[PDB]
Design a protein around this ligand. Structure first.
Ligand SMILES: CC(=O)O[C@@H]1CC[C@@]2(C)[C@H](CC[C@@H]3[C@@H]2CC[C@]2(C)[C@@H]([C@H](C)CCC(=O)O)CC[C@@H]32)C1
Lengths: 11, 242
């Protein structure tokens, strides 16, 4: 739900 | 006995771990310096350590076979809730019962009760945390078991906010059966005695530790001078309703 940093580290 | 798939899964988790947990702790030099003056003197250093550790747990999670079939939303939910838990788990590797501390190769990077208590958290957390470490240490887990537990801990279908639980559940059972079978075929008795039951119990201890952590995190994050000593990733994962 809008976690750019986490999202970015996950992709 | 075991299984080719299961042995595959084990091989992957061990490597994923070796790639995300540096036994030399060489990267610790980059953190804001530790200060052993709560005085909160340790908050800047431990905040960086934790933040860094979140990045490593994420890196390990991505390599968990099956985790890639999950949606980002689910992946984000699973990591947000498991991060602290997996960090307490992986920290067992550096924890020693000799002096009850996290020996991270270096006196400056050797943490005990009074150090980890100087970051805005109370013994209501630290006490159970060390107890947890001891109990987990006493299990003398094979490293194969260690990584399987971290992986099972990450892919738990009951985490709040999970969507495709069935898929999460499928992925986890796969890891569980891998664990259950490895203990049976590769972990000799007596050390194998009720080992799976004792490891699943540690997952319950982690929830408890996690819960207490959320409570004490919010407490100090609701104080601007404290939350500004944290890192952007910590604020995102742990919460930023500051
Ligand atoms: C942002 C935040 O506020 O982070 C908090 C900083 C204090 C404190 C009490 C809480 C609970 C988790 C604790 C942490 C202190 C440092 C510990 C004891 C880590 C070990 C030094 C890890 C050793 C290793 O990597 O092997 C792992 C568990 C960590 C998190």
């Amino acid at each position: 739900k809008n976690h750019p940093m986490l999202m970015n580290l996950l992709k | 006995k075991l299984s080719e798939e299961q042995q595959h899964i084990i091989a992957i988790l061990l490597d994923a771990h070796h790639k995300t947990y540096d036994p030399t702790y060489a990267d610790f030099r980059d953190f804001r310096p530790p200060v052993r003056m709560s005085p909160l003197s340790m908050l800047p250093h431990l905040a960086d350590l934790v933040s860094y550790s979140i990045q490593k747990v994420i890196g390990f999670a991505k390599m968990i076979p099956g985790f890639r079939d999950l949606t980002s939303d689910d992946q984000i939910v699973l990591l947000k809730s498991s991060a602290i838990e997996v960090i307490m788990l992986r920290s067992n590797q550096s924890f020693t019962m000799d002096d009850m501390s996290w020996d991270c190769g270096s006196q400056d990077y050797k943490y005990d009760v009074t150090d980890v208590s100087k970051a805005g958290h109370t013994l209501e957390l630290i006490e159970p945390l060390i107890k947890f470490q001891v109990g987990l240490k006493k299990l003398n887990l094979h490293e194969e078991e260690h990584v399987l537990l971290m992986a099972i801990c990450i892919v738990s279908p009951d985490r709040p906010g999970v969507q495709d639980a069935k898929l999460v559940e499928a992925i986890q059972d796969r890891l569980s059966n891998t664990l259950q079978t490895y203990i049976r075929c590769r972990h000799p008795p007596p050390g194998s005695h009720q080992l799976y039951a004792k490891m699943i119990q540690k997952l319950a201890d982690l929830r408890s530790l996690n819960e207490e952590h959320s409570k004490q995190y919010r407490s100090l994050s609701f104080q601007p001078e404290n939350s500004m000593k944290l890192t952007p990733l910590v604020l995102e994962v742990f919460g930023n309703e500051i």
